[PDB]
RNA sequence: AACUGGCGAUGCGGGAUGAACCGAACGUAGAGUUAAGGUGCCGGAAUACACGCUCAUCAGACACCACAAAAGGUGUUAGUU
RNA sequence: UUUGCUCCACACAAUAUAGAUGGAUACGAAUAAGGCGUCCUUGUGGCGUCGCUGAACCAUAGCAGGCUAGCAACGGUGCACUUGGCGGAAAGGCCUUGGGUGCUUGCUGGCGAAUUGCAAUGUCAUUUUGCGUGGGGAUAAAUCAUUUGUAUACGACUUAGA
């Protein structure tokens, strides 16, 4: 028999951890923690996504599950190079969080005619799904 | 300033308001704690205070300086004809207390208990529990369902009893009706006991036994409006007192600018509900013998 | 507001006896130009025999940090007045700018010793980056190697007053 | 089908007021779903109706209505300032009001 | 928004929840509050017991029957806080207090319906971890509330009933999802997804 | 100060296994199972190599690091209780009146009864907690031994004996009478 | 007693309440902006944003102002050798 | 003491609505942790996945939603009965096998709308009453006066009295 402990691991802040700045001039953009200033603030860079090098608060950014290898204090050019090498934005887009964000964005961007089309399609799908439930 | 000499307050603050009881019959405020292991049994009985008398008995107190000697004691004799149980009510426990769910009565109701239900009994049609017995008067019409309700719910079961005012020598003719808790067995056992004992007499020789400490719940003797001197026991004012000496001299200080609730005031004396405890049964006797 | 680093250089009023005075310069953190000149005159009065009426300010230039986007330790030597006496102290803070460094220095002074900008003098602010030179544990603990840590008990702010499921503090 | 609402639900909350003095000529309106002055700006300059029912028929109907308009915002939480043709009865504090989409600009 | 809003009290700070609910009632929203016995107060249980003992000490000298009435129930403690935060001596305050309802546990009409949460008043979200707090049920039982055990038993019964209901609902929902997957990957579903639903 | 990371290590013997849910920890080995709820301290646990458990506190103050030390010590104590077990030996010390200590069993509850302490008619009754066994050690007199798996339980039972044996209304420095904890150790000590 | 400003003689907004304090002085109305004071609810206005400190088994909470001292505490925090 | 009283549906008259204009849309517990799914030594278990707000999910097209026809209706959704239940915390609601009808926008059609005149809330879902519209319905008490004294200033109380 083995001694077993619950994993209890949740999204450490570190150098190279990519975050989603949610409020401010970017407001929903990807960046990378370049250095850790204090327990409540970090110097971050978002060169590929469009976030300038800046000191920000972990209470202003949201850490994301994914990260990539990055030397501490790396400049904007090096951070962009390693970001492109690791394809961080492709993995972010593949993640269901970004898919949810994009779905929400488009659903807010829908027009009235598109909403009517959504209604008609949803009625059709409801008919088929109720028929399937009855057949099962 | 302080009182020059200290003295205990006159009267008990836990027994006021010294007002008349809500009824002539004093209800049991709290029944004894329920125990499920013990058999179903009445926790109370209804008697009529007959009077007082004197007994002689050998005191058996192993250690008193005057032990194993005859003593004279004053005893109270209460006339207790067997109380007729008819009816049973159920109480469900709620975040608000015990709530009465339903009461189920029996087939035949006595004339005395119907008189209790009535006020102008002689000039009446005697229409009481007639349609109730019509709902009854069958084997399983609608009363067994209420019994099942009391079994499924009603964590407290209280039987309903009435006194035999006709058997007692009173000139009342109106029965006294009360509830007695059943503190034995499950709820099913309590309801079964109540149903089997529906419409019949329970004897106090079965309820209580000799050498038992019980509580007497009763309304004290009424004495009407009374002054402070006899109502609370305050001092009589001196002989040379203008406009009365059977009074409380100071009924309060300047501040607070109000007469306080704790000051002794003239008012009703007696006719209060009271629960005296630790009364030893010296005899449980029957009148079907000399 | 947020402080700004100024260099204020001024002299005494040039007289016939001694033209071209010594042209004293100071580096001071102030809200803007007016408070910068005020603080320069206050310190120059504390140090040298000259007042604002008897002198002039020949230049006041803002100094931007050479690199405002790299983390560097800062050693701040300050003197401040308490309710009892005057004390000199030395603090170390990790920050990206000198102006933000004195921002946090003033905030921490007010928080920990109830000292106000009125009562605080900044004697010196030195940028450093060498480990084993910083003397404060509350800075060396972040300058430790491969520093990574979680943020337990995440609290998410809500816009609406009512939420329809119990919150989760995971991260 | 079952929904015919062409307005936006709101609540008449109170009058414009200081701590101990109120001004009945201006009312405070809480628009439903609006939590910021930014959406309050879109709701600016828009007609409002307070619709109530009276037991007496006046002009062929038992329903009476007071007309006003969102004119400007109030505070940082999406509350707006409305001026009505007649000041609201002040018994309608926390009462349902309708904000119409006209005069429309979109 | 809703005609009636039902908030459970478990995990909520009494003062913050009372302030939020009072503001909503004044704005015109009917509110019922359940789990008032599971409501929370920040601070040590001894501190809150001492505070309630001072409250109990406060009473009219010449007639305690007209003095302040110290209700011992947790729901009435929450009501006292809310009435302190509502101007209760005017008709508007009476209207707001009529709009408010508070209960211990969740009676049938509200345990058969939805309960919402108030993040601004939640103990987990608000209190710093490690800071001591108090349970309204325990404090009420200490100061003389006589129905903690009855409410606990009734809440246990309701919780079992709700657990069985949730098991049934979860089974039905997972069957619905399985059938939706079977009837999925259709033109309509693909069109909705590509559109953005 | 808010120390960013405070980590500590607890070793486990090869014959013991530790199961750690959120903050309820059970330890099972040769002498049985022990359980502890630590839901009042906010400390994280991790397993290193099935023989080492790291106990971590993030962004904690002085009190939080003290609590981390306390939880490490408590889990250590419970692990050594499950492996070796605890034994508290107590002596009865009397000047004139022999202290009569026996074990009674009311409905099988295993009470400890003390009589003749200072020649009084008192009967000092102490409940015995679960997991604690009382033995009157042979080869030595006026000795009692409480042996158990939970150090807290055995020590609290010993403290209950001491508290009943406290003397009243007398100068204690002269009336040193009582039942005192002489030894605290392991059942498997020096084995 | 001195100088000045006020109250008396004066409302108004704020200090809950108050002759003097803080703002500001006054015809009847409308719109806008503020002063002093404030924005959890009472109560109009951020359960703002940022950094710290504090846990009190008599906490602390905004001048006039409605009180507290000497002394002490590896409680906790920050500061020469 | 010349239809009084209860229950069940209705043109018509309400100090009027503290204020519906699609839905109050039901696990619990924890938060230095959970939800769902899966796999098994069914356990404080391995693995996968989710959150990062309800910006959700249901319901939503039709004279305020008409009239009339078709296509795989093996569905969905209003109305009224008993069978089978569950729910006493304030249950007054939650389900369920059954039969009759409507509607169906799941897909395709045909006819109608106007003139409320450029906007007027432009009127839509409670407690009772009637010399009512009629179908079921078993036809009592209390008070005063008299009396009692377990009561009592008067009231009140405790009884009696065809």
**Cα–Cα dist F38/A27, whole Å:** 40
In this structure, are F98 and F189 located in the same domain?
yes
Q: Label the pairing between strands B83-94 and C72-81.
A: unpaired
Please provide the DSSP assignment of F95-142 as one string: SSS--EEEEE-STT--EEEEE-GGG-S--EEEE--TTEEEE--TTSSS
Q: Please calculate the CA angle A53-A56-A58 and round it to the nearest 5 degrees.
A: 135
Q: Which range marks the domain in which residue F127 is found?
A: 86-191
The answer to whether the CB of B136 falls within 8 A of the CB of B107 is yes
**Cα–Cα dist C111/F16, whole Å:** 50
The answer to whether the CB of E104 falls within 8 A of the CB of C149 is no
The answer to whether the CB of B106 falls within 8 A of the CB of B198 is yes
Backbone angles phi, psi at D56, to 5 degrees: -110, 130
B95, B97, B155, best to mutate vs chain E, most E CBs in 10 Å: B95
D18 CA vs G38 C1’ separation (Å): 11
What is the total count of domains within chain F? 2
**Cα–Cα dist B172/B24, whole Å:** 13
In this structure, are F52 and F93 located in the same domain?
no
Size of chain B in residues: 290
Q: In 3D, which of E59, E110, E100, E56 has the Cα closest to residue E79?
A: E100
Nucleotides of G under 7 A from a protein CB: 12-15, 30-32, 39-53, 55-57, 59, 75-80
Nucleotides of H under 7 A from a protein CB: 13-34, 36-37, 43-46, 49-57, 59-62, 64-65, 72, 74-76, 87-94, 105-107, 120-124, 138, 140-143, 148, 150-153, 157-162
* Distant-in-sequence, close-in-space partners of D46: CB < 8 Å, separation ≥ 6: D69, D70, D99, D100, D101, D102, D103
Q: In 3D, which of C130, C70, C67 has the Cα closest to residue A74?
A: C70
Q: Do chains D and A touch (3 or more CB pairs under 8 A)?
A: no
Query: Max Cα separation, chain F?
Result: 60
CA distance C138 to chain F (A): 7
Is the previous residue joined to B79 through a cis bond, with omega within 30 degrees of 0? no
In this structure, are F128 and F39 located in the same domain?
no
D56 CA vs H13 C1’ separation (Å): 11
**Experimental method for this entry?**
cryo-EM
In this structure, are F184 and F98 located in the same domain?
yes
Show the 3-state SS of E68-95: CCCCCCHHHHHHHHHHHHCCCCCHHHHH
Which pair of structure tokens corresponds to residue C18? 């001694």
CA distance C32 to chain E (A): 38
The residue whose two tokens read 């609402």 is D5
In this structure, are F43 and F98 located in the same domain?
no
Q: How many CB atoms lie within 10 A of CB E150?
A: 19
The answer to whether the CB of C6 falls within 8 A of the CB of C60 is yes
Q: Which residue is nearest to nucleotide G38 (CA to C1')?
A: D19
In this structure, are F90 and F41 located in the same domain?
no
Residue of E nearest to B92 (CA): E150
Nearest to B256 among E62, E103, E154 (CB): E62
Q: In 3D, which of E37, E70, E138, E150 has the Cα closest to residue B98?
A: E150
Which of F34, F55, F85 lies at the terminal end of a domain, its last residue?
F85
Q: Burial level of B240, CB count in 10 A (0-12/13-18/19+)?
A: exposed
**Cα–Cα dist A30/A88, whole Å:** 9
Q: Which residue is nearest to nucleotide G59 (CA to C1')?
A: E47
B114 CA vs H89 C1’ separation (Å): 34
Which pair of structure tokens corresponds to residue C62? 């803002």
In this structure, are F56 and F90 located in the same domain?
no
Size of chain C in residues: 171
In this structure, are F96 and F75 located in the same domain?
no
Q: Spell out which residues of chain F touch residue E130, defining contact as CB-CB under 8 Å.
A: 41-42, 63-64
Q: Tell me E117's DSSP state.
A: B
The answer to whether the CB of C164 falls within 8 A of the CB of E114 is yes
Q: Spell out which residues of chain E touch residue C166, defining contact as CB-CB under 8 Å.
A: 11, 117
Which pair of structure tokens corresponds to residue A131? 């028929």
Beta bridge partners of A81: none
Q: Burial level of C52, CB count in 10 A (0-12/13-18/19+)?
A: middle
Which pair of structure tokens corresponds to residue C64? 């931007």
B51 three-state secondary structure: strand
Element at F2 (helix H, strand E):
none
Nearest to F53 among A1, A5, A39 (CB): A5
**Cα–Cα dist E115/E4, whole Å:** 11
Cα separation values, D54 from C83, D97, D99, Å: 70, 16, 21
Cα B12 versus chain centre, distance: 21
Q: Which long-range contacts (CB under 8 A, 24 or more apart) does F167-174 make?
A: F167/F118
The answer to whether the CB of E133 falls within 8 A of the CB of E102 is no
* Distant-in-sequence, close-in-space partners of B3: CB < 8 Å, separation ≥ 6: none
Beta bridge partners of A42: A36, A56
Q: Which long-range contacts (CB under 8 A, 24 or more apart) does B106-111 make?
A: B106/B136, B106/B198, B106/B199, B107/B133, B107/B136, B107/B137, B107/B198, B107/B199, B108/B133, B108/B199, B109/B133, B110/B84, B110/B86, B110/B162, B110/B175
C89 CA vs G81 C1’ separation (Å): 14
Nearest to A129 among E180, E192, E196 (CB): E180
Torsion angle (degrees, nearest 10) of CA B221, B225, B228, B230 = -40
Q: Spell out which residues of chain A touch residue C94, defining contact as CB-CB under 8 Å.
A: 37-38
Backbone angles phi, psi at A105, to 5 degrees: -60, -50
CB contact under 8 A, E117 and C165: yes
Torsion angle (degrees, nearest 10) of CA C52, C53, C56, C60 = 30
Q: Tell me E125's DSSP state.
A: H
Chain F 18-77 residues whose Cβ is under 7 Å from strand H: 19-26, 35, 39, 42-45, 56-60, 64
Q: Which long-range contacts (CB under 8 A, 24 or more apart) does B96-104 make?
A: B96/E147, B97/E147, B98/B156, B101/B149, B101/B150, B101/B153, B101/B154, B102/B146, B102/B149, B102/B150, B102/B154, B103/B160, B104/B143, B104/B146, B104/B147, B104/B150
Please provide the DSSP assignment of C112-154 as one string: HH---TTTEEEEEEEEE--TTT---HHHHHHHSTT--B---S-
A104 CA vs H55 C1’ separation (Å): 7
CA distance from start to end of chain B = 68
Which pair of structure tokens corresponds to residue E145? 């509330």
B52 three-state secondary structure: strand
D70 CA vs H150 C1’ separation (Å): 77
Q: Tell me B223's DSSP state.
A: -
CATH code at F61? 3.90.930.12
Which pair of structure tokens corresponds to residue C104? 């946090």
CB contact under 8 A, C162 and E7: yes
Which pair of structure tokens corresponds to residue F190? 């020096």
Q: Spell out which residues of chain A touch residue C101, defining contact as CB-CB under 8 Å.
A: none
Please check whether residue C69 touches A, CB under 8 A: yes
Which pair of structure tokens corresponds to residue C103? 């921002």
In this structure, are F169 and F113 located in the same domain?
yes
Which of F64, F85, F106 lies at the terminal end of a domain, its last residue?
F85
**Cα–Cα dist B117/B128, whole Å:** 8
Q: Burial level of B143, CB count in 10 A (0-12/13-18/19+)?
A: buried
Q: Please calculate the CA angle A68-A72-A73 and round it to the nearest 5 degrees.
A: 125
Element at E100 (helix H, strand E):
strand E100-102
Which of F51, F85, F119 lies at the terminal end of a domain, its last residue?
F85
F90 three-state secondary structure: strand
Nearest to F1 among C138, C142, C152 (CB): C138
In this structure, are F42 and F106 located in the same domain?
no
**Cα–Cα dist B109/B87, whole Å:** 9
In this structure, are F99 and F119 located in the same domain?
yes
Q: Label the pairing between strands C72-81 and B48-58.
A: unpaired
The answer to whether the CB of A51 falls within 8 A of the CB of A104 is no
In this structure, are F46 and F100 located in the same domain?
no
| Count of alpha carbons within 13 angstroms of residue E175, beta-carbon side | 12
Please check whether residue C118 touches E, CB under 8 A: no
Nucleotide nearest to D61 (CA to C1'): H123
**Cα–Cα dist E9/E35, whole Å:** 5
Q: Spell out which residues of chain A touch residue F12, defining contact as CB-CB under 8 Å.
A: 3
Is the shortest CB-to-strand distance from D5 to strand H under 7 Å? yes
Q: Tell me B234's DSSP state.
A: P
Q: Spell out which residues of chain E touch residue F41, defining contact as CB-CB under 8 Å.
A: 130
Please provide the DSSP assignment of A59-99 as one string: TTEEEEEEE----TT--HHHHHHHHHHHTHHHHHHHSHHHH
**Cα–Cα dist B117/B100, whole Å:** 19
CA distance E73 to chain B (A): 10
**Cα–Cα dist E94/F133, whole Å:** 65
F71 CA vs G62 C1’ separation (Å): 44
């Amino acid at each position: 028999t083995d001694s077993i402990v619950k994993a209890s691991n949740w999204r450490l802040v570190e150098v190279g951890r990519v975050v989603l700045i949610k409020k401010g001039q970017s407001a929903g953009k990807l960046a990378a923690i370049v250095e850790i200033i204090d327990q409540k603030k970090v110097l971050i860079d978002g060169p590929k996504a469009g976030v300038p090098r800046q000191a920000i608060n972990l209470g202003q950014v949201v850490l994301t599950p994914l990260t990539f290898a990055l030397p501490r204090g790396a400049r904007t050019a090096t951070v962009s190079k390693k970001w492109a090498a690791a394809a961080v934005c492709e993995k972010w887009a593949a993640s269901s969080w970004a898919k949810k964000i994009a779905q929400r964005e488009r659903r807010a961007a829908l027009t009235d005619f598109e909403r009517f089309q959504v209604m008609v399609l949803r009625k059709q799908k409801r008919y088929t799904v109720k028929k399937a439930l009855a057949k099962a | 300033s302080h009182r020059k000499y200290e003295a205990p307050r006159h009267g008990h603050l836990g027994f006021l308001p010294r007002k008349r009881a809500a009824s002539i019959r004093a209800r049991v405020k709290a029944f004894p704690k329920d125990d499920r292991s013990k058999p179903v049994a009445l926790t109370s009985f209804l008697g009529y205070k007959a009077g007082m008398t004197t007994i002689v008995r050998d005191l058996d107190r192993p250690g008193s300086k005057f032990h194993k000697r005859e003593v004279v004691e004053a005893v109270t004799v209460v006339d207790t004809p067997p109380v007729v149980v008819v009816g049973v009510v159920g109480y469900v426990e709620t975040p608000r207390g015990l709530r009465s769910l339903t009461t189920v009565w029996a087939e035949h109701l006595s004339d005395e208990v119907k008189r209790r239900f009535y006020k102008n009994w002689y000039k009446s049609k005697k229409k009481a529990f007639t349609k109730y017995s019509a709902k009854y008067a069958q084997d399983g019409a609608g009363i067994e369902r209420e019994l099942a309700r009391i079994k499924k719910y009603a964590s407290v079961v209280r039987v309903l009893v009435h006194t035999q005012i006709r058997k007692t020598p009173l000139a009342q003719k109106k029965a006294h009706l009360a509830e007695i808790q059943l503190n034995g067995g499950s709820i099913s056992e309590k309801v079964d006991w109540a149903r089997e004992h529906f419409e019949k007499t329970v004897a106090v020789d079965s309820v209580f036994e000799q050498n038992e400490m019980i509580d007497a719940i009763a309304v004290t003797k009424g004495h009407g409006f009374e002054g402070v001197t006899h109502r609370w026991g305050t001092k009589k004012l001196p002989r040379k007192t203008h406009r009365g000496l059977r009074k409380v001299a100071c009924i309060g200080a300047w501040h607070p600018a109000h007469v306080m609730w704790s000051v002794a005031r003239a008012g009703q004396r007696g006719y209060h509900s009271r629960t005296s405890i630790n009364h030893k049964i010296y005899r449980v006797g029957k009148g079907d013998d000399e | 507001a947020h402080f700004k680093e100024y260099q204020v250089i001024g002299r005494r009023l040039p007289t016939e006896s001694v033209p071209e005075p010594k042209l004293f310069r100071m580096r001071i953190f102030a809200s803007n130009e007016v408070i910068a000149k005020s603080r320069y005159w206050y310190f120059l009065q504390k140090l040298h025999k000259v007042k604002k009426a008897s002198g002039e300010i020949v230049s006041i230039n803002q100094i931007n940090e050479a690199h405002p986007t790299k983390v560097k330790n800062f050693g701040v030597w300050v003197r401040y007045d308490s309710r009892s006496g005057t004390h000199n102290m030395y603090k170390e803070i990790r920050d990206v700018s000198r102006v933000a460094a004195v921002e946090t220095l003033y905030q921490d002074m007010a928080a920990r010793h109830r000292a106000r900008f009125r009562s605080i003098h900044i004697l010196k602010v030195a940028e450093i980056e060498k480990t084993a030179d910083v003397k404060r544990q509350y800075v060396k603990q972040f300058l430790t190697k491969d520093l990574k840590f979680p943020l337990p008990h995440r609290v998410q702010k809500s816009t609406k007053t009512f939420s329809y499921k119990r919150p989760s503090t995971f991260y | 089908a079952e929904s015919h609402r062409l307005y936006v639900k709101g609540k008449h909350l109170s009058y414009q007021r200081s701590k101990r003095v109120n001004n009945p000529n201006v009312s405070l309106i809480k628009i439903e779903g609006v939590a910021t002055p930014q959406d309050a700006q879109f709701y600016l300059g828009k007609r409002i109706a307070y619709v109530y029912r009276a037991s007496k028929e006046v002009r062929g109907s038992k329903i009476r209505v007071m007309w006003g308009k969102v004119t400007r915002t109030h505070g940082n939480s999406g509350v707006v300032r409305a001026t009505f043709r007649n000041n609201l009865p002040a018994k309608t504090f926390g009462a349902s009001v309708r904000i119409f989409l006209y005069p429309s600009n979109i | 928004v809703e005609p009636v809003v039902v908030i459970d009290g478990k995990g909520h700070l009494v003062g913050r929840l009372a302030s939020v609910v009072a503001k909503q009632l004044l704005n015109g929203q009917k509110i019922v509050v359940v789990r008032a016995e599971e409501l929370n107060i920040s601070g040590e249980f001894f501190r809150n017991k001492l505070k309630y003992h001072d409250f109990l000490r406060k009473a009219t000298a010449f007639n305690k029957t007209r003095g302040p009435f110290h209700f011992r129930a947790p729901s009435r403690i929450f009501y006292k806080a809310l009435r302190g935060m509502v101007s209760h001596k005017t008709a508007r305050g009476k209207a707001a207090l009529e709009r408010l309802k508070v209960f211990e546990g969740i009676p049938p009409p509200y345990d058969k319906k939805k309960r919402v949460v108030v993040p601004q008043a939640l103990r987990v979200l608000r209190l710093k971890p490690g800071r001591k707090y108090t349970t309204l049920g325990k404090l009420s039982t200490s100061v003389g509330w006589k129905y903690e055990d009855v409410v606990a038993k009734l809440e246990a019964k309701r919780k079992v009933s709700s657990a069985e209901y949730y098991a049934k609902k979860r089974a039905f929902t997972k069957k619905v999802a399985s059938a939706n997957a079977t009837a999925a990957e259709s033109d309509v579903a693909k069109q909705l997804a590509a559109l953005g639903y | 100060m808010k120390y960013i990371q405070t980590e500590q290590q607890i070793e486990v013997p090869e014959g013991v296994t530790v199961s750690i849910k959120s903050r309820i920890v059970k330890v099972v080995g040769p002498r049985g199972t022990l359980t502890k709820n630590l839901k009042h301290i906010d400390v994280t646990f991790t397993k290193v190599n099935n023989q080492l458990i790291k106990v971590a506190v993030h962004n904690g103050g002085r009190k939080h690091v003290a609590a981390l030390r306390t939880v490490k010590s408590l889990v250590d104590n419970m692990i050594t209780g499950v492996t070796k077990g605890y034994k508290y030996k107590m002596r009865y010390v009397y000047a004139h009146f022999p202290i009569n200590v026996n074990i009674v069993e009311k409905d099988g509850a295993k009470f400890i009864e003390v009589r003749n302490f200072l020649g009084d008619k008192k009967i000092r009754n102490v409940p015995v907690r679960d997991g604690v066994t009382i033995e009157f050690s042979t080869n030595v007199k006026d000795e009692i031994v409480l042996s158990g798996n939970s150090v807290e339980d055995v020590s609290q039972n010993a403290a209950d004996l001491q508290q009943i044996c406290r003397v009243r209304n007398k100068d204690i420095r002269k009336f040193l009478d009582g039942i005192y904890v002489s030894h605290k150790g392991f059942i498997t000590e020096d084995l």
